[PDB]
Design a protein around this ligand. Structure first.
Ligand SMILES: *[C@@H]1O[C@H](CO)[C@@H](O[C@@H]2O[C@H](CO)[C@@H](O)[C@H](O)[C@H]2NC(C)=O)[C@H](O)[C@H]1NC(C)=O
Lengths: 48, 49
């Protein structure tokens, strides 16, 4: 029984995750490259 | 040669993001060579890294 949520009307920089947040053992992207997530805009985003 | 933490070992590779790939050490996209990594828990201690 997993959740889902929708994120909208917001600005997202991943550098904020660097300060005080725990590291990430797995970080894998398929349709995009991680080096180009700071220069894009997405029509819709969903989080599971 | 350097010393990192385990979760950061995956970051020593072309086309990666993170603190150990943007502000600390980076590798060109056309990188020829090899990468070796091994655990060194017993010999490395303290808070001097
Ligand atoms: C970096 O992390 C520290 C963790 O303490 C943040 O410190 C507090 O963060 C809250 C929320 O951003 C602020 O309201 C406080 O004013 C901060 N206090 C301190 C110690 O400055 C700090 O803000 C973070 N900085 C960032 C996100 O760059």
């Amino acid at each position: 029984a997993w959740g889902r949520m929708r994120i909208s009307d917001c600005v997202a920089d991943y550098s904020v995750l660097y300060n005080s947040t725990s590291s990430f053992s797995t970080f894998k992207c398929y349709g995009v490259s991680p080096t180009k997530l700071n220069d894009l805009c997405f029509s819709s985003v969903y989080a599971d | 040669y350097f010393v990192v933490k385990g979760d950061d070992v995956r970051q020593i590779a072309p086309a990666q993001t993170g603190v150990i790939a943007d502000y600390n050490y980076k590798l060109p996209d056309d990188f020829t060579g090899c990468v070796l990594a091994w655990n060194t828990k017993s010999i490395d201690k303290g808070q001097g890294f």
